[PDB]
Structure 1
Amino acid sequence: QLTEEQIAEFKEAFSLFDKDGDGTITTKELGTVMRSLGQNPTEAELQDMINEVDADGNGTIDFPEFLTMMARKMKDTDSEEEIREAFRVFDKDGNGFISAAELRHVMTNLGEKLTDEEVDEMIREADIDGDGQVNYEEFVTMMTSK
C-alpha cells in the first residue's frame, strides 16, 4: 500500500530504531524512540501493537512488520496533518521555522552524532529562500527529495 519511494524512506528510518542492525526491533526500541520524540506510550500499548503483527511471537518485529504496524485506514489528508505534526516535532517553539538549535535537539534526541557546523550545513541545504531557517514548505520539499 506504499510507494517504492515511501518504503525506501521508512527503511532508513527503521535503522534509527534498530541501532545494532540485526534487522529486528523490540518493545524497548519502539518505546525509546517514541519517547525521545515526545510521545508517552504505555508498555501495554506497545505490546498490544507488536503482538498484532509479530508472526514469530518472540516479541521482535522486522521491517515489513514495522510497516504493517504503522498502517491503518486513513482519512483524506490525515497524512498531511501527520506531516505537519512531524514538522512541529522539529519546530519546538512553534514559530514556523526550524533553527539550528532546534534541529540539533532532534538530532540529539535520536542519538545522531554530528558537529555544530554539520547541523548548520543541514539548515543551509534545506533553506531555499535563505532566511537562515527551515519553514514547512522547505521541510516537505527536503523530506520528499529524490
Structure 2
Amino acid sequence: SEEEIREAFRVFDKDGNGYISAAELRHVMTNLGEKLTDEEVDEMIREADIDGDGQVNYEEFVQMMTA
C-alpha cells in the first residue's frame, strides 16, 4: 500500500493543497505521537524545504525515497 505514509500526511493538511506551512507541521511533529527534539524537527523540515517559501510539499517527502 502507499497509504503507509501519504494517507497519514493528509490527516494534517487543512488546506487540501498538498503543502503545509512548516510552522504548523513543526508544532504537531513534536506534539503528536512521540517526542523528538527541536533538532530532529528543524533539520527534518530543512532537508525537505529547499525553497524557503514555507509551504513544504508532503508527498515530495514521501516520494523522496522513491526518487
CA distance in 2, matches of 1:136, 1:104: 13
Work out whether residues 18 and 57 of structure 2, in 8 Å CA contact, stay in contact via their aligned partners in 1.
Answer: yes
Task: Identify which of 35, 42, 45 aligns with 1:123.
Answer: 45
Shift in Å, 1:138? 1.5
CA contact (8 A) 1:99 1:134 kept: yes
If each structure's helix is expressed as a fraction of its own residues, which one has the higher value? 1
The answer for unaligned runs of 5 or more in structure 1 is 1-78
Which protein has greater RCO, CA pairs closer than 8 Å, 6+ apart? 2
Residue deviations 1:96-146 (CA, integer Å, cap 9, x gap): 21333332343244343345464232211112444333214422134558x
Q: Report if aligned partners of 1:91, 1:97 keep a CA contact under 8 Å in 2.
A: yes
Distance change (3 Å), C-alpha of 1:100 and 1:83: same
Q: Highest Rg: 1 or 2? A: 1
Seq. identity, %? 96
Q: Distance in 1 between matches of 2:52 and 2:29?
A: 22
Deviations along 1:39-98, one digit per CA (max 9) or x if unpaired, are xxxxxxxxxxxxxxxxxxxxxxxxxxxxxxxxxxxxxxxx34564422212324433213
Contact 2:30-2:37 at 8 Å conserved across structures:
no
Q: 1:105 to 1:142 in 2, by over 3 A?
A: farther
Structure with more strand by fraction: 2
Q: Does 1:144 align with 2:66?
A: yes
- TM-score, L = length of structure 1: 0.32
Secondary structure (helix, strand or coil) at the match of 1:139 reads: helix
Cα 1:81–1:130 shift into 2, 3 Å: same
